[PDB]
Design a protein around this nucleic acid. Structure first.
Ligand SMILES: Cc1cn([C@H]2CC[C@@H](COP(=O)(O)OP(=O)(O)OP(=O)(O)O)O2)c(=O)[nH]c1=O
Ligand SMILES: [Mg+2]
Ligand code: NA
Ligand code: NA
Ligand code: NA
Ligand code: NA
Length: 327
DNA sequence: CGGCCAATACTG
DNA sequence: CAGTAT
DNA sequence: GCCG
């Protein structure tokens, strides 16, 4: 459907991103949920009482909405730190988060030019900066397909039995993808071991991969690869590539995890938590012991999960297609 | 007071 | 480990 | 931020 409180969610959205780039995770989550509510609603909130009546909206949020209605403007959006815009600019560099952005700001940096010429950058951050504009763009679904096929072909070259599945936003059927997430496994439950070394060198052979961000190749148990690639020919931009290699016994949970969305995964994992269970990309466990703070103290037993449906079932949830997980 | 939309993988 | 990432 |  559509949001009937746009004149409201617009002002709130500003604060949400403001608190988020400043590291106030939960308060930012608060506005997130409030904004999400005001949308899936049916009519324009006209009363303070009508606000409090919406789950996710309490006294505070409601008192905010009346000002956007009575004043047409929120006096809060004008007291937001002047650093926010710069912090957002900085944290959009792959490899730099709230802490680095805040440090750079305190050191007096205000633009990417300042970062380029004066800032201390990690190796990942330098790569992020070099592809600053490209990394903020989403590619057409068709391009994602080409990248995914490029990886599959390279993998099945030294083992036709290797199964390669494009997950993430691609599997959820989106029209555009931020990056390409590829899951690789093997039904024989063992031929997946030590394939990263070969796969990556192969992709570097053709010049497909242009930069590596996260890739522990000295360890034979390497689980993921986060990097950069670019297809051949003119008019091609550098795209982020995310690859995970998993044992067949973990295929179901890894597929579920890698498909997402991130919100969906967090919601599902939270659900499992309430049932004394734990869900990760490796497996769904039961009889998990946790303390008062909600932290895991006990391991638990790994439950049988041959397919994604099994996970939902064991959690008492009705199955949802990847497209129904686009939260 | 304090958990919430989690649980886990690299980097240095 | 803290930071950043998925 | 919300909510118990
Ligand atoms: C960031 C993040 C992601 N995940 C999962 C679930 C999705 C996949 C792929 O992540 P991606 O950001 O590419 O997401 P994607 O949905 O593919 O979106 P883009 O099109 O790449 O932006 O990983 C997660 O569990 N927790 C997180 O914090
Ligand atoms: Mg993705
Ligand atoms: Na409410
Ligand atoms: Na970043
Ligand atoms: Na490496
Ligand atoms: Na990704």
């Amino acid at each position: 459907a559509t949001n009937h409180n746009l004149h409201i969610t617009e002002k709130l959205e500003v604060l949400a991103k403001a608190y988020s780039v400043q590291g106030d995770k939960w308060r930012a989550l608060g506005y997130a949920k409030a904004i999400n509510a005001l949308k899936s609603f049916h009519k324009p909130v006209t009363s303070y009482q009508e606000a409090c009546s919406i789950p996710g909206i309490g006294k505070r949020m409601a008192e905010k909405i009346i000002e956007i209605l009575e004043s047409g403007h929120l006096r809060k959006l004008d007291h937001i730190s002047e650093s926010v815009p710069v912090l957002e600019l900085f944290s959009n560099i792959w490899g730099a988060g709230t802490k680095t952005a805040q440090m750079w700001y305190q050191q007096g940096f205000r633009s990417l030019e300042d970062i380029r010429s004066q800032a201390s950058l990690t190796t990942q951050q330098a790569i992020g900066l070099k592809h600053y504009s490209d990394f903020l763009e989403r590619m057409p679904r068709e391009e994602a397909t080409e990248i995914e096929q490029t990886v599959q072909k390279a993998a099945q070259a030294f083992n036709s039995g290797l199964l390669c599945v494009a997950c993430g936003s691609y599997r959820r059927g989106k029209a555009t993808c931020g990056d390409v997430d590829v899951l690789i496994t093997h039904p024989d439950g063992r031929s997946h071991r030590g394939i990263f070394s070969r796969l990556l060198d192969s992709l570097r052979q053709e010049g497909f991969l242009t930069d590596d961000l996260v890739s522990q190749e000295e360890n034979g148990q390497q689980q993921k690869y986060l990097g950069v690639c670019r297809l051949p020919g003119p008019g091609r931009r550098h795209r982020r590539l995310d690859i995970i290699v998993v044992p067949y016994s973990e295929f179901a949970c890894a597929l579920l995890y890698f498909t997402g969305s991130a919100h969906f995964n967090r919601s599902m994992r939270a659900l499992a938590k309430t049932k004394g269970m734990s869900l990760s990309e490796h497996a769904l466990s039961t009889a998990v012991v946790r303390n008062t703070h909600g932290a895991k103290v006990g391991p638990g037993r790994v439950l049988p999960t041959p397919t994604e449906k099994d996970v939902f079932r064991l959690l008492g949830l009705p199955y949802r297609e990847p497209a129904e997980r686009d939260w």
